[PDB]
Amino acid sequence: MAHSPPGHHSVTGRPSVNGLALAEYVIYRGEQAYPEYLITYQIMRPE
């Protein structure tokens, strides 16, 4: 696993071309996330 940028604890990846795309985030220590909910689902075929 890489290290965070110096002085930082994560990276925010922000799409600059697709205006409807939301951000993606990267952490470099597993201790900075807790798996709070487990969601079971199917994708639905569009009608």
Which residues of the shown chain bind other proteins in the complex (CB under 8 A)?
1-2, 4-5, 7-18, 20-46
Q: Write the Ramachandran bin of 19: left for phi over 0, alpha for psi from -120 to 50, otherwise beta.
A: alpha
Smallest distance, other proteins to C-beta of residue 19, A:
11
Q: Cα–Cα distance between 34 and 36 in angstroms, integer?
A: 6
Smallest distance, other proteins to C-beta of residue 29, A:
7
CB 16: neighbour CB atoms within 10 A?
7
Smallest distance, other proteins to C-beta of residue 43, A:
4
